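does this look right to u?? magnesium ion version
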Amino acid sequence: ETRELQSLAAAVVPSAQTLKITDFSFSDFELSDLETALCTIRMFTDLNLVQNFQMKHEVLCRWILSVKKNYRKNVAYHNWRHAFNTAQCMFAALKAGKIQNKLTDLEILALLIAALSHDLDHRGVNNSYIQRSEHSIMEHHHFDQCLMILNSPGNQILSGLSIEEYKTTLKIIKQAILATDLALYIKRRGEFFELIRKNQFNLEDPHQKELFLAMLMTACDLSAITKPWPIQQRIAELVATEFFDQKNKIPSMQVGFIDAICLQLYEALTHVSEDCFPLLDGCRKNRQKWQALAEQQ
Ligand SMILES: CCCOc1ccc(S(=O)(=O)N2CCN(C)CC2)cc1-c1nc(CC)c(Cl)c(=O)[nH]1
Ligand SMILES: [Mg+2]
Ligand SMILES: [Mg+2]
Ligand SMILES: [Mg+2]
Ligand SMILES: [Mg+2]
Ligand SMILES: [Mg+2]
Ligand SMILES: [Zn+2]
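got this back:
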């Protein structure tokens, strides 16, 4: 054991409501690492994951500490906090967004783990340890890092699954993490948009289900863009720090990013579940804000 594990295992886990992890407008700026750790336990708990898969408290805690440890603090945006926020957005979409009832337990288990693990060991959009020797290169590496952790002694939060359940969950996890490659999202989204507009969308079809999960991953991954203005400015500042340093051109970049990538996604997601409207809403409000700024710059 480490001190950190000891403290985390021994701590009381406040409720979902006390932790605010059900709010789409959630922010982690004022939280310590330990506090994000507790939030994460609460997520697995209220999703019924500890229950239905018999996770041992000490194993979950060690797992989360392992996941956090394998992000780099030295990377301004792509770090544990971003991973943690992606998972909190998944949680909020499942509960407040009422998507939980559209999915199986194994899908839910896999999305949470995928959300937390999808950028593992990221070195910043600039850094180029993609050699070699020459596709979703980063995402494959994030998934390897995830599997490694899931297989570490003391960390095996899936031990309680049968082999069948386990194989299935692993495949879903892998797909979810690969889905976070924006290049995949752009190739796949057309089909998702067609289905929605032709009123054809059907989650009971395995193919369409898998496509939705992919889209849900992207939605959560990009969710900083949906946050209240003061918070989104701060995050945008971290992103900029990573992109450029590891400035009035920035407001129009954000507008372009919102137009090209974000709006349609959150519009589609709201069609699937009207209770995910808050994401669409916050994204629009942020477009106002950035546009206004761009017109002075
Ligand atoms: C404010 C700093 C600049 O912000 C951006 C500028 C450009 C673009 S992009 O989509 O046109 N660009 C195309 C090339 N590709 C390699 C990288 C992405 C994205 C952002 C942007 N992305 C994210 C998602 C990571 C968040 Cl969360 C964010 O806030 N801002
Ligand atoms: Mg809210
Ligand atoms: Mg701290
Ligand atoms: Mg079920
Ligand atoms: Mg990524
Ligand atoms: Mg063991
Ligand atoms: Zn990400």
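The pocket of magnesium ion (ligand 5) is lined by residues 118-119, 180 (CB under 6 Å). idk if thats expected tbh
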